[PDB]
Amino acid sequence: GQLRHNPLDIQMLSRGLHEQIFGQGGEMPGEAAVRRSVEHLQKHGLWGQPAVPLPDVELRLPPLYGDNLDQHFRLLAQKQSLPYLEAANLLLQAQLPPKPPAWAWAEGWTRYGPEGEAVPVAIPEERALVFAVAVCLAEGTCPTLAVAISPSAWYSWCSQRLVEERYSWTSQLSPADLIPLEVPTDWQEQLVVGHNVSFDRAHIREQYLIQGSRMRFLDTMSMHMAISGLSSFQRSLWIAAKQGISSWDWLDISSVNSLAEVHRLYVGGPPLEKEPRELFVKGTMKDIRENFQDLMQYCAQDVWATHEVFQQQLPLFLERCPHPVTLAGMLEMGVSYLPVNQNWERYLAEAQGTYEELQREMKKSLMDLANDACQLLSGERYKEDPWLWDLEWDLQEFKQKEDLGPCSEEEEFQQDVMARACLQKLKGTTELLPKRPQHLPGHPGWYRKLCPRLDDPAWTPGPSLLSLQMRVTPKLMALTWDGFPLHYSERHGWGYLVPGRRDTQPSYHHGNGPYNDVDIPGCWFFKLPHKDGNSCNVGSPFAKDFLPKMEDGTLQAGPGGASGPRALEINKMISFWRNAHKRISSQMVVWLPRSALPRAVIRHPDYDEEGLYGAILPQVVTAGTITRRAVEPTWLTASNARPDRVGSELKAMVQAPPGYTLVGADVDSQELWIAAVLGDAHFAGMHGCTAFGWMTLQGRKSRGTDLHSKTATTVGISREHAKIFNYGRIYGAGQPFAERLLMQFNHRLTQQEAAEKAQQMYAATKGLRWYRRAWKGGTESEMFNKLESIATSDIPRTPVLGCCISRALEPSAVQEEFMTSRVNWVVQSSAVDYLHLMLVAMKWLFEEFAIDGRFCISIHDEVRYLVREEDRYRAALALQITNLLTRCMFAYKLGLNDLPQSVAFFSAVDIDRCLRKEVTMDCKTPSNPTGMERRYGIPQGEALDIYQIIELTKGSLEK
């Protein structure tokens, strides 16, 4: 029946599914390839181990266009990007009218005529635009000025915050405080290119309606990254070389992502201006009022530069990215939407409060020891302190330029007047001493810098500028590693001093040292271990990696019995929110009023009238990574959920409005699967051709043969170590890395044998190198050879959709350098194209069956869609069939004509009301000690598998 198998006994797709999705017939592999593959697998001895068959799945698909998978995808992509490319070419080939004479002064939009006539048009009416937005951050995040360009003429928009001067404005943004840039219901859809368009997008008025109007965007920064981008190391070296290894031609075919540098790289000409006054970054609303003309001129200059880059760039992008699916997906990664209810403000309050209280606890614990350290200055008691001796203990001199009886009432008044006058007389003696005040003299040198100066507006009493990272904090706490006092040198980082030097080496100690170069005679300076190897200096003892060292007895607080462990526990508590508090609290929210909410959301019983439901539009650079990934300052870097990190529930606070539920999933072992499938296509085109491939696909993690376990079995080390080594190897690492990590995980193995162990371990995994040169005899030799073949080609296209690598990484310019970056680029760019395929398929499938759906976020592998409550499982079925289609297409591009069932469907299409890793976890955070059902009352979502989905949905897509 539906059950079938491959020449390597792997459960493939069902007969109905395979017939629908693979046409009919194919050039099946020959017996010679089978014999070679079997011989290979036997040689490594991973052959035969069967697995419990996965249940057969049947599904009749909606009509698949074209006469092949690739043709169907391309037809869909043409349908998706038909209007957007037309508008893009319309704008690219169009006469640009002359710049306006003088920018007018009227709230909102204003149209500028060819001769300079100015007319306020209610809304722009053009199919394409290039947009620059200006934000006066001092007076909030409301947008201020907009100058727009179009085929007709320039357009200008100014906020009310510049025209009229009210007393105060609402601190929470309303939809009325944005720009009316939309086409209300001769054409449909519009394209607004721009530089860092995500920044410009967030101030567009209609992009906050959840109904999901038809519009897309293109970031020229994304295009530049995709075309002539630079890595982190590449960017650093570019900047350094401009300020003042071989194959330096790449310095001439790339630049950083600032607008001026891109202008120089593409069109060159005169260097763009900068406006050094930087009024928008720092200024005043009245100041921007007075200097309108120059600032608007700079905005229009930015618009013109962006247009120049876009026009001179768009043909090149298609010349290097000739698959329409790539552009179509790049359109859909920039339309992210996240809904946020009234629980946002309470979240900020709770996070800030918890952070503040823990900060106060830590700071007072430090200050207590700080103040007591002053009492070691009198009597020269600083000298004998084993820890506080080398700090600054120098004072500063103050600069300079009987009986009884009651009283009569008149006498009392006279005495009061006399005393007051005598006091006021001395107040005039100011005519001496420095005019600029001194800052706490008398206190020792170390103390004065800790305290703030009284001229500071936010001054607080005492040494309140103490954090655990300060170089004097550990000595102020007097930490003693293994009963040896600490010490810091900038030549070898932190460390501990062991007394016993008579002028060498220790008599009775071993460790990272001694280092005779840093000499404090009488002792030796060893080095604390780090998680990055001995070549790195330990920067701050109060670090995460020292948490095991708190309890094990190796590390002692010294001047405490329990403060130390509490100190590092508080450190780990507020570490994340310390960094994230700026951008987390700097986000924009447009609380959509009840008027603009959908009818259904209001009709829903769980709707709240007093509550406020709003949304956030993430700023995502669609291609900000050399691997063409997305870049988002906060959400791509947001902690998921933990019970020991403050503010770690940020993702969970993203909640659907009433009447909507989130539907999402996550790819499984994506990088490893792509490596395996590439290796299989390279060897014989059969799945499981390589040992790595079988371990990735049919590997039995429960009992027996699997990728993570098998490496451990060969080496003989713990499973966790083997997994770490395998991830490092797929990222690309050498033998010295392996030997260092092996010596780290076990101090009982000597390097003399550790080197042999590492070389044998690598030989088993990747294999040796014989000269015909390539990788042969290794369990993963085929995939490494395939990756290097793709990387070292003259024009390395992505294996899947053929988007060429960034021209700064071409072999013609780098040659035998940056190999690791390119080989990683192969896999990661394949993954990004895979995400694009997923998104385009999802868009088509949701448009085909009139599913009311929207995009939540594309967190690399993850995909989350926001769909209405009633058709929640229909969206799940759409996602599952999308996964099937995209994986089949991925296999077909390499040429394989079959796909295993075990990967044919998503493992868990999660339905939930708040984004989190699992629908089950309540994620009781330190800022929400009770729980989500108790602080905000969300239920645990339902997670479904393919069989459950087809059973609930009857395996159909219509209503």
Partner: protein
């Protein structure tokens, strides 16, 4: 104990608590039967009460103060174990009149028991007596709260000192908050107030880790919490919170339900009562214990000092005179004294004492009193207007201009919070 003994010694010596060492037992201090407090102790309690009142009533728009009569006149519910208040005039008339009988005496005692008043054991029952009027005050807007600081009387049991069956009457000053909340918002406000109280007690503490919270339920299953302090001998209950529900509220006015309904938006409900009561005296002793370091790490740490939070220390600054013209310097010191008094700063009149104590001795004496700063006016001060300041925590000597002392002190006290 030795550290605790030293702390009790200091609190007696520098006039923090009043009484003799026999009366200064831990049980006496905890039970509400201590002989009294020293003047500095009264100042400390006043400061703590002021901070609590600000943080609870001042910064809440829906909370109002309430005053409970110190006694509850009868007739009372049967079974009450509270003491009875009897006028001495009635007893004098009873004992002087020789025409009375045994039966007349029995009838008189029955009448006294049936018609006697009681001292307040808790602030809650009297607080509810003002619910109708206070509800009218806030235009029937629920939630709303009533607060009150004052002394409540409790019984004390003992076995060693009690010879002739004498049951002692103990007094304790209590801060009570009655918070009337909609039933849907029971645990919401309960947790919120627990968090706020724990933050308030941790805010002024030198070592907040010794403060703790613990959840506990009553015999009826209504939710509650108890907060403790880690004394050198163990935790002591310093504050309790209970979700009383509505049993007490319905029992107080059983007549009609329509008078006691409260509005939560557009709906009228009978509200649930959250009662928050804390032990001021125990907390004062606890802050005294917290301020004193129990040194048991650096072996060379002398100078017993009382690191009270600056907003709670009883006397802010102290003045002294050095060598120079006594009359002019005294005029300067009196001027500075009046100036610092006019700005809400408590000042210790140290320039009046004629003892020529050594400077180290005076520094120790002012430190034991937990004085934030030591101000010294000398001949140079009359010369140019520079004054000295010895910070309690730092013990470092600095100089500031004499007109710059007022602003520095006010900014210090304000921003310390």
């Amino acid at each position: 104990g030795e550290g605790s003994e030293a702390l009790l010694e200091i609190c007696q010596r520098r006039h923090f608590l009043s009484g003799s060492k026999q009366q200064l037992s831990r049980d006496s201090l905890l039970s509400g039967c201590h002989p009294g407090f020293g003047p500095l102790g009264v100042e400390l309690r006043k400061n703590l009460a002021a901070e609590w009142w600000t943080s609870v009533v001042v910064f809440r728009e829906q909370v109002f103060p309430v005053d409970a009569l110190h006694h509850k006149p009868g007739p009372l519910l049967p079974g009450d174990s509270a003491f009875r208040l009897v006028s001495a005039e009635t007893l004098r008339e009873i004992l002087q009149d020789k025409e009375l009988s045994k039966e007349q005496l029995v009838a008189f005692l029955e009448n006294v028991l049936k018609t006697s008043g009681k001292l307040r054991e808790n602030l809650l029952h009297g607080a509810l007596e003002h619910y109708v009027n206070c509800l009218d005050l806030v235009n029937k807007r629920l939630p709303y709260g009533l607060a009150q600081i004052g002394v409540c009387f409790h019984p004390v049991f003992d076995t060693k000192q009690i010879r002739n069956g004498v049951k002692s009457i103990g007094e304790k000053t209590e801060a009570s908050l009655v918070w009337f909340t909609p039933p849907r918002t029971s645990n919401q406000w309960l947790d919120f107030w627990l968090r706020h109280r724990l933050q308030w007690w941790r805010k002024f503490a030198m070592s907040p880790s010794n403060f703790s919270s613990s959840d506990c339920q009553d015999e009826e299953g209504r939710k509650g919490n108890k907060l403790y302090y880690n004394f050198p001998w163990g935790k002591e209950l310093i504050e309790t919170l209970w979700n009383l529900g509505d049993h007490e509220l319905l029992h107080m006015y059983p007549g009609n339900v329509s008078k006691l309904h409260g509005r939560d938006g557009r709906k009228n409900v009978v509200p649930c009562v959250l009662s928050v009561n804390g032990d001021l005296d125990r907390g004062m002793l606890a802050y005294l214990y917290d301020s004193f370091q129990l040194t048991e790490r650096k072996k060379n740490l002398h100078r017993k000092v009382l690191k009270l939070h600056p907003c709670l220390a009883p006397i802010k600054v102290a003045l002294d005179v050095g060598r120079g013209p006594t009359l002019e310097l005294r005029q300067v010191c009196q001027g500075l004294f009046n100036e610092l008094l006019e700005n809400g700063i408590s000042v210790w009149p140290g320039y009046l004492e004629t003892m020529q104590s050594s400077l180290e001795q005076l520094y120790s004496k002012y430190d034991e009193m937990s004085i934030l700063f030591t101000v010294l006016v000398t001949e140079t001060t009359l010369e140019n207007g520079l004054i000295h300041l010895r910070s309690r925590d730092t013990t470092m000597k600095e100089m500031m201009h004499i007109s710059k002392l007022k602003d520095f002190l006010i900014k210090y006290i304000s921003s310390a919070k």
